Design a protein around this ligand. Sequence first.
Ligand SMILES: [Ca+2]
Ligand SMILES: [Ca+2]
Ligand SMILES: [Ca+2]
Ligand SMILES: [Ca+2]
Ligand SMILES: [Ca+2]
Ligand SMILES: [Ca+2]
Ligand SMILES: [Ca+2]
Ligand SMILES: [Ca+2]
Ligand SMILES: [Ca+2]
Ligand SMILES: [Ca+2]
Ligand SMILES: [Ca+2]
Ligand SMILES: [Ca+2]
Ligand SMILES: [Ca+2]
Ligand SMILES: [Ca+2]
Ligand SMILES: [Ca+2]
Lengths: 162, 313, 314, 318, 312
Amino acid sequence: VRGARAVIVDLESDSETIHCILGIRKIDESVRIIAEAERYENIEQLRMAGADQVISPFVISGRLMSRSIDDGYEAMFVQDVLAEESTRRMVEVPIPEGSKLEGVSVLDADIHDVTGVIIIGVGRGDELIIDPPRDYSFRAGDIILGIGKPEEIERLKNYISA
Amino acid sequence: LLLVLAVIIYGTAGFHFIEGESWTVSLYWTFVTIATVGYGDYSPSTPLGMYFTVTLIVLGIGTFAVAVERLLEFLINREQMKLIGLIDVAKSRHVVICGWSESTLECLRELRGSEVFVLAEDENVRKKVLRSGANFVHGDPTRVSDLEKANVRGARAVIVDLESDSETIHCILGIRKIDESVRIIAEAERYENIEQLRMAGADQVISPFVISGRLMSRSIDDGYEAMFVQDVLAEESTRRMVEVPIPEGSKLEGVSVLDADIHDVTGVIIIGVGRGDELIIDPPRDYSFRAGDIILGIGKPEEIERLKNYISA
Amino acid sequence: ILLLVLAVIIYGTAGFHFIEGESWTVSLYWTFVTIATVGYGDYSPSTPLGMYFTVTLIVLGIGTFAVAVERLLEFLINREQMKLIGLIDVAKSRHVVICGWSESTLECLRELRGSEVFVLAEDENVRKKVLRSGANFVHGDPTRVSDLEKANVRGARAVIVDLESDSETIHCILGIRKIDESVRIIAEAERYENIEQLRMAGADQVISPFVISGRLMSRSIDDGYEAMFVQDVLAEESTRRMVEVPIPEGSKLEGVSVLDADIHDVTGVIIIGVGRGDELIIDPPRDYSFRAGDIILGIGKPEEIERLKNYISA
Amino acid sequence: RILLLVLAVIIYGTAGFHFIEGESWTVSLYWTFVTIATVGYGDYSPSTPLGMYFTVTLIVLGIGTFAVAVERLLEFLINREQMKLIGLIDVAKSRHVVICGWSESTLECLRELRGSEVFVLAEDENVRKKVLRSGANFVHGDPTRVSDLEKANVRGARAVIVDLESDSETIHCILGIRKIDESVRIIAEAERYENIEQLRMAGADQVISPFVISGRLMSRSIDDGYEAMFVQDVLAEESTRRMVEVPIPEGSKLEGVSVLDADIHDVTGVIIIGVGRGDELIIDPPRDYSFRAGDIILGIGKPEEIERLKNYISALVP
Amino acid sequence: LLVLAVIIYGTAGFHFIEGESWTVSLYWTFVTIATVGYGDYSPSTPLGMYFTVTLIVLGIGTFAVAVERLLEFLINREQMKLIGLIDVAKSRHVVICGWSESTLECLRELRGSEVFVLAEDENVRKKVLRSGANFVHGDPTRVSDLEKANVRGARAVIVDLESDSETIHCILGIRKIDESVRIIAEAERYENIEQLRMAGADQVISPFVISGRLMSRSIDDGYEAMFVQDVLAEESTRRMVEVPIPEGSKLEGVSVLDADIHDVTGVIIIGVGRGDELIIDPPRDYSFRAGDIILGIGKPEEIERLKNYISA
Ligand SMILES: [Ca+2]
Ligand SMILES: [Ca+2]
Ligand SMILES: [Ca+2]
Ligand SMILES: [Ca+2]
Ligand SMILES: [Ca+2]
Ligand SMILES: [Ca+2]
Ligand SMILES: [Ca+2]
Ligand SMILES: [Ca+2]
Ligand SMILES: [Ca+2]
Ligand SMILES: [Ca+2]
Ligand SMILES: [Ca+2]
Ligand SMILES: [Ca+2]
Ligand SMILES: [Ca+2]
Ligand SMILES: [Ca+2]
Ligand SMILES: [Ca+2]
């Protein structure tokens, strides 16, 4: 575990998951820990134990269920963007240092028009802004969350450099 | 059954001759002496009745105790028949949940405010279900006679998560033997049986472990992928993900989405557009909006309102 | 449910109001006595328009009341608990919460005779023993936070945690630290291999009895006095009690070295250790300067306990 | 019995090579050992077809018997371990310790008995792996069956330690021990307080009730945990203070000397928490306790000041 | 069939591919396949060095096929063939269906007889061998498995299974094979001793009924239970023996009182056996017929005396 890229933890019960996480942090207190949460009631308890990211697939499912009564496009969206069988892949693209976009407003940049990548969100460290407002200034090192074909991602990666 | 009448008629005789009452006065006495009401309109007027008073206390008590249990059971099935009568009017809009899992629980928490029935084979869940806000129906969701007990026919939709995928499939078949048109949403424990669920009549299928495992993998490098899905689904964020329908005879029918500049015009992100039973993610620029198309987008509730107007005639 | 109770009540007060000719006051006491079989006597059927209405109202009213009386008591077992549950408005370190029912938490409870303690357990049959040991019982999963709140862990004296596994024990502690993050948490550890994990979760004090027992065993091979001591001080059968004594501000001992203080000579109380915050020094050196607030750990007779308690004040 | 049959194929080959090709008693044995062990050096091939039959059948049937010897040899590799074990049980003047049951306690006990001869006896086979990495020998057997207590050489052991799954089984084991060595020291863990006496009735010398200890420490740790901090810290070797039992030899400078007259804490710095008279211990002895010979002094102190008590206590020179 | 494959490939590749006789070419195959590889026929041409590797593989498969299948078959066949030619086997064997504490304690008294245990639980195998009996893994209710214990032509079959139903089910299966072989069966409930006999149980022993009655009789004084348990152990010097009255007896027609057996031989006559029924404490005027069976307690020395006192 020490000198691992990350550790993914899904054990039979949430207690055992936690108990595992604490043990990890008693070895490599910085290695990335991703953990599955069976109950919503203890997402926070998992994070307290040192879980860096927490995915609770039953909470996702139930909410997708409810949204799939009227029309199922919500659940259709989530599942298809995540399969590489869909040509649209969901990629995180970094803004290089000394960017052509540093300081450029997202509206001034017209990324959707320029590269065809849909900007679903923009990442500032460990927090994410979905559908950024028009007046969001691109800083360097921001992370772009987007959907697009592999060809139009390569275009954004060039459009973003110095 | 017939034994309850025996003590009643037996009392009407010991008051008809042994206390000097009519058949109508003796019958009204026996029904009150059995319920220990002792209102008082007929007390033993002769020691042949005061003897009959002591003796009928045993015979009258037995008829009262047996009748309440059978009538309450007949009032509990009638309450089951009267509770069944209330779901039929609410039925053009009710939702039936087959199985009680963590998935179906968190779905129910987002259906706060609808007529919902949970059907589960384990009884102790009833307390949890009621403190969660739904009606409970004890039954095996594979037996059709219990699906009928939840008025699955003519429901808004039925949601199905059972212990295994085999039971889930079996249940869907039971539904389609009642309402072959009701919307069926079902979770699949294994990816290996998504198609089998759809073959059996599942209209929409959600596989949360495939969602999970994939978010896990994408959370190693950077966790924004997993962060996106989970946040769009909580109603607490100002960005809501809404399906917007394109009315017939729209300002957009035949208008290209590139000519529409919807993100530019209304600020709503267009992540996909739906034509019937399929959804196209990041639609191409030259997609003609037909009538009835569904717009899948994220946006502020204000800029959603702009999309709803910008799309009309 | 409550619609059946209104039926016998409304139909009887009306069937005596019109079908027997009574006021609302005579008909309701008629229905309330005819349905409840009280038969106080203020309204019996004086006409067969009532004698028919009596039997049908009393039968339907006796049957509807019988279903309703239990429903009221079922609401009176939870709502009378809800008025008593509403009564815990103290904002004080009064009660003690014990999470889990093991043999340890039983032996602990037997030494808390005279205190108000709450046991929180997921297994229901435990209720009989808990009451016969002197505590109140709360049915709930001590890992669920909404059930920790059912024991008012928030603003408790301390919480004691022994669950079936160490994983469950940890999970509970983390939940506690999500309500009252300062309450003292005492937790039992089944494996030595994860004591640190228990403290990481927020347990202030951790007791691992298999390590105690294992170590006492090892020491009882040759001669058993090591084990004999630990078990004997903890039973009140010895006249010697083991007490923690604090050093107040303005002591006759404040700043005085323990050798110059010569506590063993002065008071006869054995000084096995002195406590500084969250750490303890056993058999302190002769040249230990007592600071204020130090805790003195000692064994002695109840008479000589008072002497050290006097010797330390102004 | 079946393994006893394996020796036959070698001799039949030693017979099938002695006459069917004309070899001596010395030549017949050297031929079979290469044909059966598949070494096949090659010094004897069929010079008449009558030998190729007796060779091939005896080489094949004997080769199967040669391979079978490994299983007996693996048993023979356990008997050579018995010749090395005989050298270790006579290393010093202390004999071995038997641990009946594998609990978390006996695991923690075994970990502090590093350096004594220890044998664990448990009916669970998978326990064997943990026992070896914990440093003791394992014996697969039911510690209630006496024929399996005997398999752990309980007679003439230093002591036997008993923690079984239930208190009932523990008792049965103790009684089993006492049907062999009615004097060997028996230490037993008690899972319920309700039957300590029953454990001693069966012949248990010392009984440890870790739930009674623990339950009581909790009750006392609510306010401040120095009590519990004390017990656990005296028992870990990480603290510099050791808790030692010191005996008062016959004819001591202290025989007849009061514990107050001895000024032991002042003289030696060792804290005297108790003194032992046989199978009972007096905690915080009264000021006028007369030290007799053979009494045991229970005290805490640094290794240097332990040395001080050991001399201040010793007997006068002849 | 695998042994023939390497044999055919090897005995020809040394007869033709290197020039050896029919006896020399096959002798090459038998050592190279068993990896003995003595060496008297090695590849003298690469045409043999090529087939050597293939024959080393093909011969290894036949050697493994010959070693695993034949040696297991050579250990069980050696038990049936060496027993037939070296020394004789006294009488037919015994079958024990089920492995309980009863059938275990039964085996302790059949030390030195050919016994076969049939039980469906495999791990029982080791204990049975160290008890001195042979083991057969099978369900004693399935008839095809009773056939596996040679029930037919057994001396007797002893049946104690987990439940009384399974015991019965077993008994009926036996009688569907050897409808005369002696069947002894343990009864867990008194309520169905008769049902066991209906199924064909010749003798029925119900050890819990014995125990309970011994318990009750052991309250006042325990000599009853002391008697039963000690007469049955050979640790007691008194053994309980069945002695037959030979044809043309010295006692035939002699009253038991006229015979004074207790006085004459010291054997206590606890009962006398007339076929499948037993008379306990016979009356004084019981005439000894020939072939009657005497049930008695005595030391081994005084039994030999009765056996002489009883002859012609
Ligand atoms: Ca999982
Ligand atoms: Ca929808
Ligand atoms: Ca695009
Ligand atoms: Ca599920
Ligand atoms: Ca990523
Ligand atoms: Ca926007
Ligand atoms: Ca415990
Ligand atoms: Ca010792
Ligand atoms: Ca003292
Ligand atoms: Ca234990
Ligand atoms: Ca304290
Ligand atoms: Ca010192
Ligand atoms: Ca049995
Ligand atoms: Ca008796
Ligand atoms: Ca005799």
